[PDB]
């Protein structure tokens, strides 16, 4: 494809037909052979288009197809929920796998399981069992608070309480992402790199960042998923996965990022009082949550940074902010991140 | 090409010997001419779909895929040579370093 | 959307118009209050409306009258001759002329490659148009044989079989094949016999056909207005 | 994706219609309709080339660059 | 199972065979599709042919049309005459010979050991087809008597007791005798008397035998087709 254009085809039509006869001299606007001409050439300018789009894409798939290097689908949320006993067990009761949970909280009435049995032994207070969200996609990133119910009817069960919000919840991946991790498989054909070793820890798709720290004859692999922690199992399943690319010899050690928690408080004062309710300080946490756990590994937190986007929401509405418990910017090491803990606001 | 063949067939498809100047002659040859150069350029389309033989925009855009990007008047056969060296990059010893050297 | 658009006459009055197209003269007052007119409604010259050129009218000004208007159901004795030639012509439709040479294809008329385009004589395109498009697109539905063109198996004739015997069988064979294909033609009424003989080799036959009247094609294209296609897909 | 036959007759038509009111008749058999057809017929043609083209592109192009027939 | 083989024609389209065949174009994709074809589908001539044997076709070319063809509900005005003959052949049954020696068996109509057996000078046992095998089996029913042939009580006649006196009464019996014999013959469609005549001693009479039309015959083997037998167990 030349990418041909309407003006150039419709000229060496009607030059081709005043040259192959001299009677034919009438061109202008509204005659029948130049709109003939006008629509062979316009659906021939249609072809080459579509063709050339046509030709992007297949390359497109022909890159898919070649090293079956599928596009991620969207993921399911999934946490933790910490559950409470009236007093310490005698029985070492079973929870087997399916086991629902579900939330009174109708803003968000998801409903998650368990995918594996937990014993809780005798003389425990508390047990903590990851959970999955029955749903896929965004909507299984509820925030801290929300699950309150366990649907076992266990009468052994004091209250039930997810200690921070989700976040593992995602849609379908982006374009850019595909074609970044695309890019890091090509870098990583050479095993024994640094970057290698990156995308072997990455290769699992529940990995979010790695940070690779590297010593004499050392290698650590900090990892973490969206919410900041590192499973026994993801542990094992990126370990396995760096079997393959991890150089020969050299010692390799997995172990999880250092997170830290960050309680939020805010005074907010507002401008039109009429607009105090439920939903502006749910709106305003939402915020922040957002803020917070969008901060990737080595990333600050910087206070004006968050008044800023705080105040962004509506400059006019939101007179004043100030913050019952942050006084000074956190650094994070690059072995560390923040994620949100436990968001609370005060309309006034 | 088959413009002629699945043309209307009372149609003529020749120049009449009576007028040498035949208008119909001229209009089915031009639209003949744009059936041919299309179709011709469509045939050489195939080209462009593959690594090989790729030119310029579409050897850009394969290069961009994976992740090697043309350099000042870098022509296409160095530059499809150099992207299919990157894939090929031997690494953890001392021969690729040399070689990188 | 249409509207009645009405000319204001020598001394006339909006209870006059009211009475004419409302069939009564109590809409004079909404005619007033469309309009946007003053009190002297309709003056008697320009010297009157350049005191008050936007709220007053003049003779020979324009007012609208707001009756849904529709150009069917409108009586054809009013339609001026013209027109009806105009739009008996937009209904048998404009076609490009490439039946020009009578004689050429009408000597070889079972053979390909016997008909062209030809130009006006002003440089442009040749094009026939009412009766002569109806010629055109009979000729060559006849000369046509049945499935030889593409995307269109049951247009043609089987005319080309029929170089039979000379006995009034193959006779009535012609007659039949010939007044189904003019019969196929959606704009073609009727076509029936006239007179027929047979000279030895040579076989002769005319034939009469009636075309869609003047009050059905003005009645079709003045129905097409609702959708403004103007345009034949039959 | 890409066009076919009967959508690009509809927009030839609509197209010549839009150019010029000097022409009316689309019916079947018509000198007009029969040229925009065959135009129409050789894009489609043309369409499917591209398609094949582009299939044996996206299960060969790429591999065929490392010498493996 | 069958299907249609078309011949690739001279300037021929994959859209032409598809409106001729599907009776639409838009079954081509399908027709190439099943052939296995690549884009130049039909080239001039074997010089193109060479570059891709296996995935192009030339003129003179088979292509393989899927659609489920069936002998049967075929018009037999396309059936060629020597085609007709043959199918007829088939349909009334080839049989051995012994009606040779007309004039002997007619000598010694009413005795045994009148027929045999006989050569067709190849070297081969002689054969009688259609007409022959029909006027063959004929002969040999009416000369049976009825009930003495094994396994088979009705077939034959009772003209042997026939010999009666020369009256018009004893003629009808006769009539009726040979009219039940030919009616026997399931291919026989109807048999009627002509004329008949006593000269004393000697009963004279002949008769008019109609058997099934071309036309039937055809339909029957044609269906036949589908059992693949092509044979007579009447």
Wanted: aromatic residues 8%.
């Amino acid at each position: 494809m030349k990418t041909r254009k309407l003006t150039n085809i419709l000229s060496k039509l009607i030059d081709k037909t005043m040259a192959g006869t001299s009677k034919i001299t009438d061109f202008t606007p509204g005659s029948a052979s130049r709109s003939l001409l006008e629509a062979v050439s316009l659906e021939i300018e249609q072809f080459y288009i579509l063709t050339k789009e046509n030709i992007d894409w297949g390359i497109q798939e022909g890159i898919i197809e070649a090293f079956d290097f599928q596009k991620r689908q969207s993921k399911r949320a999934y946490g933790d929920v910490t559950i409470q006993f009236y007093q310490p067990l005698d029985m070492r009761m079973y929870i087997p796998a399916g086991t629902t949970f579900t939330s009174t909280r109708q803003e968000y009435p998801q409903q998650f399981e368990t995918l594996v049995d937990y014993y809780a032994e005798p003389d425990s207070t508390e047990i903590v069992v990851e959970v999955y969200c029955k749903e896929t996609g965004v909507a299984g990133n509820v925030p801290e608070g929300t699950i309150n119910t366990i649907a076992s009817g266990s009468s052994l069960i004091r209250s039930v309480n997810n200690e921070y919000s989700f976040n593992t919840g995602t849609k379908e991946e982006s374009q850019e992402d595909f074609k970044r991790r695309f890019h890091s498989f090509v870098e990583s054909r050479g095993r024994a790199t640094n970057k290698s070793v990156r995308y072997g820890a990455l290769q699992i798709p529940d990995v979010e960042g790695v940070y690779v720290y590297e010593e004499t004859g050392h290698i650590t692999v900090f990892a973490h998923d969206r919410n900041g922690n590192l499973s026994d199992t993801l542990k094992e399943d990126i370990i396995d996965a760096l079997q393959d690319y991890r150089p020969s010899g050299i010692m390799l050690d997995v172990t999880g990022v250092e997170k830290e928690e960050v309680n939020v408080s805010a005074t907010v004062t507002i401008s039109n009082k009429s607009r105090i309710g439920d939903t502006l300080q749910k709106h305003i946490e939402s915020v922040i949550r957002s803020y917070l756990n969008n901060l990737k590994t080595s990333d600050d937190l910087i206070i004006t940074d968050l008044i800023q986007a705080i105040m962004n929401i509506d400059d006019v509405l939101i007179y004043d902010v100030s913050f019952d418990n942050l006084d000074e910017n956190i650094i994070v090491p690059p072995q560390g991140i923040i994620r949100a803990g436990e968001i609370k606001v005060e309309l006034k | 090409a088959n413009f002629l063949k699945n043309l209307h067939p009372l149609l003529r498809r020749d120049r009449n010997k009576k007028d040498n100047q035949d208008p119909n002659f001229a209009l089915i040859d031009a639209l003949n001419e744009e059936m041919n150069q299309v179709e011709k350029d469509a045939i050489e389309s195939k080209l462009q779909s593959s690594l090989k033989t790729s030119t310029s925009e579409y050897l850009d855009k394969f290069g961009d895929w994976f992740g090697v990007y043309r350099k000042t008047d870098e022509k296409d056969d160095v530059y499809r040579a150099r992207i299919i060296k990157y894939l090929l990059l031997k690494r953890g010893t001392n021969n690729a370093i040399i070689d990188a050297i | 959307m249409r509207f009645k658009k009405h000319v204001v006459q020598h001394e006339e009055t909006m209870q006059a118009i009211a009475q004419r197209y409302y069939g009564d003269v109590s809409y004079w007052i909404d005619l007033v209050e469309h309009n946007n007119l003053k009190y002297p409604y309709l003056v008697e010259t320009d010297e009157e409306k350049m005191k008050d050129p936007e709220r007053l009218a003049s003779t020979g000004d324009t007012l609208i009258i707001p009756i849904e208007s529709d150009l069917t159901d409108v009586s054809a004795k009013e339609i001026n001759s013209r027109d009806k030639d105009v739009l008996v012509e937009l209904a048998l439709g404009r076609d490009l002329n490439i039946t020009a040479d009578e004689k050429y294809f009408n000597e070889h008329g079972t053979s390909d490659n016997i008909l062209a385009f030809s130009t006006n004589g002003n440089g442009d395109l040749d094009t026939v148009k009412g009766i002569d498009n109806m010629k055109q697109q009979l000729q060559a539905r006849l000369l046509t044989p049945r499935g030889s063109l593409m995307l269109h198996p049951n247009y043609g004739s089987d005319l080309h079989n029929l170089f039979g015997l000379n006995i009034p069988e193959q006779a009535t064979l012609i007659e039949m094949e010939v007044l189904r294909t003019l019969t196929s033609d959606n704009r073609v009424k009727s076509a029936n016999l006239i007179d027929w003989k047979i000279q030895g080799n040579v076989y002769s036959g005319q034939f009469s056909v009636e075309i869609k009247s003047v009050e059905e094609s003005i009645n079709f294209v003045l129905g097409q207005d609702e959708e403004g296609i103007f345009a034949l897909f039959e």
